[PDB]
Amino acid sequence: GKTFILGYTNETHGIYQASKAPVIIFDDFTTANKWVDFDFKAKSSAMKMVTSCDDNKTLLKYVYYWLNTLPSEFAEGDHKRQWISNYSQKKIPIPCPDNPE
Amino acid sequence: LNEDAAKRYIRTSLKREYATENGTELNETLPKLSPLNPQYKTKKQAVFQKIVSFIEKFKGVG
Amino acid sequence: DMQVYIANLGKYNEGELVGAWFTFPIDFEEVKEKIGLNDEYEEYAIHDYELPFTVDEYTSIGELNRLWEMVSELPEELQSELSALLTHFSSIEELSEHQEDIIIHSDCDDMYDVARYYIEETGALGEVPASLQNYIDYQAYGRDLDLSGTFISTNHGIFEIVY
Amino acid sequence: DDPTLINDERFAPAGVLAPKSKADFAFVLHALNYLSAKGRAAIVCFPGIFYRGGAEQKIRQYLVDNNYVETVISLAPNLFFGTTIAVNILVLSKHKTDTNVQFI
Amino acid sequence: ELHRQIWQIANDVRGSVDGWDFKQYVLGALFYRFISENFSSYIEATDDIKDDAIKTKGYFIYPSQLFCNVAAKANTNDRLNADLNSIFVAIESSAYGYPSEADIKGLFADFDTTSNRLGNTVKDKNARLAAVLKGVEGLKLGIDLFGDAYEFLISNYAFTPQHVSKLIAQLAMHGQTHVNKIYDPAAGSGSLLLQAKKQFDNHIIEEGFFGQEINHTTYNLARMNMFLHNINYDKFDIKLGNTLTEPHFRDEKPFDAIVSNPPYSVKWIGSDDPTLINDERFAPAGVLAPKSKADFAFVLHALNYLSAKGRAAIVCFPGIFYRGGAEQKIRQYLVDNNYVETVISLAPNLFFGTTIAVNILVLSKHKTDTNVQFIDASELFKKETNNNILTDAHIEQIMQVFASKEDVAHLAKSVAFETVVANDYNL
Amino acid sequence: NFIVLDKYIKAEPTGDSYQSESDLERELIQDLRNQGYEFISVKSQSAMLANVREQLQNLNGVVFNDSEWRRFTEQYLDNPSDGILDKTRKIHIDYICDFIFDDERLENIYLIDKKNLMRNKVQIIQQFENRYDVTILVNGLPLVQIELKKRGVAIREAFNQIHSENSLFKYLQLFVISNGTDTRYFANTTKRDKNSFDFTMNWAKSDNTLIKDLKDFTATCFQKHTLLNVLVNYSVFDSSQTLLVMRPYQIAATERILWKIKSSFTAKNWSKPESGGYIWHTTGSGKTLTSFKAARLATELDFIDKVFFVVDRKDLDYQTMKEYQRFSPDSVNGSENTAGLKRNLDKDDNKIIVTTIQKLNNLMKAESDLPVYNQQVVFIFDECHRSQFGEAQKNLKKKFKRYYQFGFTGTPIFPENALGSETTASVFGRELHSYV
């Protein structure tokens, strides 16, 4: 929803501290909200991380934008449900064969 | 005769205007050691009769 | 600690039965020279053991060295409760397929606290008004989380096998 | 597995028993026990009996391995006195086409 | 260390049923240990510890007149638990009836009846309460910090927390080296009465910590609660009964400090069936309290038993605010004289098994006259779960402004009497 | 001394030809009154309950009125809502009522005194109001029902013929069926084919001398200590629920074991190769049951502190433990390791410990002078000195001394089959009791 509740101290609590721009998922049963990690923030209880192995083709704010290329199947959260394989497999249109030029 | 607890007994005898076998902290005011099992009235009933004669003497006056 | 008493197929009568303790990994030849033979190669009578799981008396030693890799791969909170995970799964290989799906509540200890975690901390159902925050049933929601998913309760925390 | 229910008349073709607190596919195996070569079963389920580990995956595997299961039906929550969650309806038959109309 | 042995209690008693069933057995065994250790430390205060049945009837009567429980020669916990793991169960079922011999004087007794035999079979009962007594033996208590474990074990999840009780005590206690103290209607436990002698062993004992309580199973744990804290015996009582329908003591006396914690709006069908419209205490109000809101009946009962010197400190749910004219005229009679002095707001929740806040009325037959409606919403450290804890030197600010009628903003102040009769008597 | 006899007593026919149903009754009453019993006359049902509130007085030493006896009669002893199973459980498990007097003190009313069983007073009655019945009635309650037949009713059809009011005859534990020539006994299991004469029991002497007639059977088994020990200390109310009665060779072997313990403790013996002993009961026995009664009567015997029934694991520490959990309440695991087994050696009141010999060697080859050393410890092996002379045993002779090392064998390594190991010449010494 709103990605801002009040202040906490970001040290000595097993912190992930949000390095240079991965994205996240919310939630159990919600499966809709995404965020760019803004500067350096927490991992608060549901921020399961989606990021990239590859680092010369992706620029994963591109695929952050390309989550809005799939609100088609990601609009109907109906039953009690988790969609791990759905984002885990496929698909996305990609400008490959331009890797990584 | 423990003097602070003697003052305590004086104040309770002024408030009650009598005394009895109760007043359950009666043993540690007695001077050195009377909690023991072979109790030979040392000096339990003697000081008890002293203080009841005292409150008979100063009954209302003092 | 994670060991066996493996001797011997020779001496079926077991007159002064031998072969004491071997941790992992296991050589064939070192154990065979430790325990001797019956003039041929028939050994590994798995009589006694001490393992987090269950193994039969005819298991080959190569399968034991195979299983020990997957057992020692896991963290200690999994290794402390491998039989409890085996009450839902069927093998250590199948546990190794889904070894990241298991969510561990070290903080939560019972279903009331699991419901209170999913509601108050996460906000899985949404925002919680403060005047509503005390007037929310957790026991019925805990029962329906029990009957919806699959939760297992141990000494440490609560193991949640998610799909 | 305390009695001979791994080698009984009805749970043995499944290859395993239902787990220790989820009785529902034990009911559907008991259901497919008492059915001829002509009739059809129509039972209900809570929708949660979906994958629930390999112990339930192999029961679903044995159901789809033959042409036992035919049609599932979803219904809307709540629809019930005294619950919250939805339901599903399994329609089983020893009767072949074979395809699974998952009519929701 | 304190929390070491507190954690020993919190683990080493919980087996294997609901806590409100083995509550009685664990607390009875702990109470039996305290009777044993207290009577042994009495008779051995010269080192004839291992006793014998030669007990001296002329000396046997003297603690029965003094401590009121002469245990036995050899029925103490020190002897019963070394010679334990043996048939049978009801040695202690006799050895509870024998320390309740005690017919003279001031029994305060018939008391250990909560411990029973169930259980399903008698050898299972033997093994289980043998394990209970052995676990009581396995505690590192020595010699004087005994009742802390009792106050911890009575605090279970299911009770009037110690800092709020300390606040109620400190409000009713300043500038008063007088007598008697202290009365309590609906005491519940002996918790909120106990913070007097937590401080007031200093000058002198004054009189007995009086009290009256309704529920008999709570009455037993209350009578042992202020027994374990080394408190003397003769007047230090609680009488069983309801305070509204069966009031005592009317005869003795107008007090000089009272505290309470009444439950929220218990029902009582009294109005107006007896002569409580023309009784000794409800008649100056002009009406009785309504049919399910008992709380101002408690505060009228409170202002009944108070002298021309002392002061009342009671609590209320904050809802007793206007609630129609039947409550408006009670508030009118309270403010019509100079009865009420201050009210204090506290933050929600601050309680077990409750949601709403509280208020605290401080009443006095003592005049200035103005109503310092001294509030607090924070702090009130209500952060740590659940509302743990208004710490020390934190209620000292609350007592500090309470001292002489000060007027500090971001916080409350005095009002005018004409302003509060201009408004419709709020809180 | 013993229960199963060692000397053949004189058995003579005193005919009284056994084609009758009353002469053997008279002979049986004569023999039991020769054995110091008491025959009263109750041709009713209520006066039998009047016997209970007088015979129980001597056993408990306290006095009921009628009003306490109402409560004790209707709440505990003679519940109408109970059958045979819970009443048998009251005989063997819940035999004490924590009764509250009208004087308000809790006292423990017994039914059968099990520690000092000489106080348990017996009586004899016969039928009243079916076939002919004699009843040995212990402490007011009817316990043993002798049922008599003739020669025309054969021993197989003797049981097969016949399988509130009265409810008091549901306390019957045994049914000693006899005719005049053969005599068999059993407990409350009433099937046709399976609970025929095969599941019933021929009472016998020590080794193999079976007993058939009545007079010899009465001279052997119906002694006070003998029959009360058969009722009390040698019957297991299994949580099937089923009452199981031991075989006579089982009882004889258990008695030789426990008397060897009792004679060795009084003459300060331990760690001797003649202080042990061994049993050969091959199969068809329920060696679980014999070993369980040996260990259970060892634990209460107060001379000792620990009992290790210890085997070598090839799915035995799961199997026999499951047997001892069948005999429901109490037996402590040696599962699963040598860390927590030490916790089991710390714990008490459940002194039977079932571990493996490998965990014991893992404990004994290390861990530096364990503090459970000086206590009196009884080992019960399997694969005994007639099956091994193992390296664990010489580790034991190194470390422990205050042990009574007994064992069982299935097939003994005799000199006749000495292919595997040695004989028993310096490990357990003498053989104690056998069956073949």
XYZ file of C-alpha atoms in Angstrom, chain C:
163
model
C 26.861 -38.337 16.876
C 25.492 -39.468 13.485
C 27.215 -42.851 13.460
C 26.583 -46.597 13.088
C 27.577 -50.021 14.464
C 28.224 -51.873 11.208
C 29.505 -55.456 11.592
C 29.030 -58.216 10.480
C 27.160 -60.522 8.099
C 29.685 -63.182 9.036
C 29.065 -64.768 12.452
C 25.293 -64.981 12.208
C 25.590 -66.522 15.682
C 27.426 -63.267 16.585
C 29.900 -64.909 18.966
C 31.776 -61.854 20.261
C 30.180 -59.579 17.690
C 32.500 -56.779 16.596
C 32.608 -53.432 14.818
C 32.004 -50.370 16.893
C 31.648 -46.867 15.523
C 32.206 -45.115 12.208
C 31.306 -41.506 11.507
C 30.966 -40.108 8.022
C 32.429 -40.459 5.378
C 33.004 -44.223 5.411
C 35.597 -46.338 3.632
C 34.820 -49.909 2.653
C 38.371 -51.097 3.267
C 39.036 -49.293 6.562
C 35.869 -50.717 8.132
C 36.574 -54.121 6.556
C 40.048 -54.242 8.080
C 38.651 -52.931 11.369
C 36.065 -55.723 11.605
C 37.671 -58.514 9.586
C 35.642 -60.757 7.291
C 34.226 -64.275 6.960
C 36.827 -65.182 4.254
C 34.628 -63.354 1.699
C 33.112 -59.884 1.247
C 29.740 -59.766 2.981
C 29.594 -57.031 5.614
C 27.713 -53.910 6.822
C 25.334 -55.527 9.267
C 23.679 -52.283 10.347
C 22.691 -53.293 13.858
C 22.694 -50.069 15.865
C 22.850 -46.477 14.720
C 22.425 -42.895 15.846
C 20.983 -40.759 13.054
C 18.304 -38.057 12.758
C 16.355 -40.355 10.407
C 15.495 -44.044 10.064
C 17.502 -46.569 8.040
C 17.143 -50.312 7.486
C 19.548 -53.106 8.386
C 20.428 -53.942 4.753
C 21.280 -50.466 3.444
C 24.440 -50.146 1.357
C 27.117 -47.870 2.785
C 27.174 -45.833 -0.423
C 23.553 -44.891 0.200
C 24.543 -43.819 3.715
C 27.289 -41.585 2.321
C 24.742 -40.340 -0.228
C 22.231 -39.406 2.472
C 24.847 -37.856 4.771
C 25.646 -35.146 2.207
C 22.026 -34.000 2.050
C 21.617 -34.242 5.829
C 24.765 -32.218 6.542
C 23.784 -29.699 3.848
C 20.821 -28.409 5.863
C 20.939 -25.822 8.670
C 20.780 -26.973 12.273
C 17.147 -25.990 12.892
C 16.174 -28.304 10.041
C 18.590 -30.997 11.237
C 17.139 -30.809 14.751
C 13.679 -31.755 13.420
C 14.237 -33.982 10.386
C 11.738 -36.611 11.527
C 9.117 -33.888 12.028
C 9.641 -32.844 8.419
C 9.536 -36.520 7.434
C 6.033 -36.706 8.944
C 4.911 -34.671 5.904
C 7.502 -35.494 3.232
C 8.697 -38.953 2.166
C 12.465 -38.763 1.556
C 15.543 -36.645 2.126
C 15.777 -36.081 -1.639
C 12.219 -34.728 -1.689
C 13.139 -32.521 1.265
C 16.148 -31.349 -0.749
C 13.870 -30.407 -3.652
C 11.774 -28.091 -1.469
C 14.397 -27.072 1.102
C 13.762 -23.340 0.608
C 9.956 -23.496 0.810
C 9.947 -24.199 4.553
C 9.380 -20.980 6.506
C 10.517 -21.047 10.130
C 8.871 -19.112 12.965
C 11.450 -19.030 15.722
C 9.441 -16.213 17.310
C 6.009 -17.846 17.107
C 5.325 -20.895 19.258
C 1.599 -21.606 18.804
C -1.183 -20.848 16.348
C -2.393 -17.754 18.217
C 1.033 -16.174 17.756
C 1.156 -17.280 14.107
C -2.158 -15.529 13.445
C -0.984 -12.471 15.402
C 2.185 -12.397 13.285
C 0.346 -12.656 9.965
C -2.149 -9.958 10.963
C -0.278 -7.424 13.104
C 3.211 -7.589 11.587
C 2.608 -8.368 7.922
C -0.869 -6.989 7.361
C -1.752 -9.894 5.092
C -5.458 -9.032 5.245
C -4.885 -5.268 5.146
C -4.502 -2.348 7.510
C -5.445 -2.728 11.163
C -7.341 0.111 12.883
C -6.182 0.582 16.465
C -9.704 0.548 17.900
C -10.236 -2.638 15.881
C -6.766 -3.968 16.783
C -7.932 -5.581 20.010
C -11.296 -6.743 18.637
C -9.985 -9.248 16.078
C -10.522 -12.969 16.601
C -7.239 -14.846 16.296
C -8.318 -18.357 17.289
C -10.810 -18.916 14.466
C -8.414 -17.335 11.977
C -5.714 -19.609 13.370
C -7.940 -22.658 12.867
C -8.633 -21.619 9.295
C -4.928 -21.081 8.631
C -4.442 -24.593 10.004
C -7.140 -26.073 7.770
C -6.066 -24.096 4.697
C -2.314 -24.710 4.578
C 0.017 -27.175 6.272
C 1.651 -26.215 9.575
C 3.927 -28.356 11.759
C 4.755 -27.512 15.380
C 8.103 -28.307 17.008
C 10.122 -27.251 20.050
C 11.965 -24.379 18.360
C 9.272 -22.593 16.358
C 6.649 -23.420 13.762
C 7.540 -24.932 10.400
C 5.327 -23.809 7.519
C 5.493 -25.829 4.307
C 4.342 -23.417 1.627
C 3.456 -24.128 -1.984
